[PDB]
Ligand binder design. Structure first.
Ligand SMILES: [Zn+2]
Lengths: 49, 207
DNA sequence: TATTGAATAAAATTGGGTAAATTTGACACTATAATGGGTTCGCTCGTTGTGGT
RNA sequence: UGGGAGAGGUA
């Protein structure tokens, strides 16, 4: 993972019960952006018709 | 034209038996948007949709809807038949109810009615003439002589007459044929008219 | 001046039958000698019927 | 289309 600057304080109920508030710089700098490669298949079969 | 595909679509999910299924496109239509188009075409042309679903025994609750619409039509149209136009309120409502129910059962009657299929042809109305096959060599067909081509025993209109003369006793058969039975035939012609205009509006919607 | 009930004739229906097609189900393919089978566990706890000194 | 196993996971 990544090393995140973390402050321990309640912030307006946005970290209420094991919730996490994240800055928009973590989304801008693309720190937790993951790549998800996905394979689709297509089979050409011998139909009796 | 357009309507009978929806009667195919009112069934449950049938199992397929073929090779590679699932075209996965919008080639014809889906199975839910046809019902959505039936919903869009219900504010106008609901009579024919209710009558069609009641006739083909899919959603067997709109039989009462079709009988109620036919009763409303008979209440609107009863002012041109000399036998019914002189009766009093609840009695005229009950005779309109009983001849509406019998007219709708006459419209509903096809070769799938229990006890109505032809004896010989088994509903097809098409038997094979053995002499023309013996002289021609090939296989031929002819009209089923018992059913006379229609494939089912038709509904006699005198059933409604017997069911109304338990309520109007002084109404004999000649005046029944003279000033009551045209209203009955007007009801079944109105059923066919409403089914045709509902098929037309369905084809106008899903075009 | 109509309209309607008794009578009515023609057509549709219906129950029964019936001679003739036609479908159904079953068979049918043959000799050296040969002669008794492969499954199952530490997988706890309550209930209930069945069998036993 | 859509059925059954087995394995792992989340609260
Ligand atoms: Zn027939």
């Amino acid at each position: 993972g990544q090393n995140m600057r973390v402050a321990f304080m309640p912030w307006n109920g946005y970290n209420f019960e094991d919730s996490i508030l994240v800055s928009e710089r973590v989304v801008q700098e693309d720190r937790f952006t993951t790549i998800h490669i996905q394979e689709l298949a297509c089979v050409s079969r011998d139909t009796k018709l | 034209m357009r309507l009978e595909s929806v009667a195919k679509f009112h069934s449950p999910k049938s199992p397929m038996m073929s090779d590679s299924p699932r075209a996965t496109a919008s080639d014809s239509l889906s199975g839910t948007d046809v019902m959505a188009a039936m919903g869009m075409a219900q504010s106008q042309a609901g009579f024919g949709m209710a009558a069609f679903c009641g006739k083909h025994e899919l959603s067997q609750n709109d039989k009462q809807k079709a009988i109620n619409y036919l009763m409303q039509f008979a209440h609107k149209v009863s002012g041109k038949y000399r036998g019914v136009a002189k009766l009093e309120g609840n009695t005229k409502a009950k005779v309109l109810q009983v001849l509406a129910t019998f007219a709708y059962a006459d419209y509903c009657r096809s070769a799938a009615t229990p006890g109505a299929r032809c004896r010989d042809c088994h509903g097809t109305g098409r038997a094979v003439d053995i002499a023309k096959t013996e002289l021609w060599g090939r296989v031929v067909e002819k009209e089923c002589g018992r059913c006379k081509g229609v494939g089912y025993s038709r509904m006699p209109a005198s059933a409604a007459y017997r069911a109304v003369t338990m309520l109007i006793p002084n109404l004999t058969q000649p005046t029944w044929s003279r000033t009551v039975k045209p209203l009955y035939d007007a009801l079944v012609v109105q059923c066919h008219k409403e089914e045709s205009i509902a098929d037309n509006i369905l084809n106008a919607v899903t075009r």
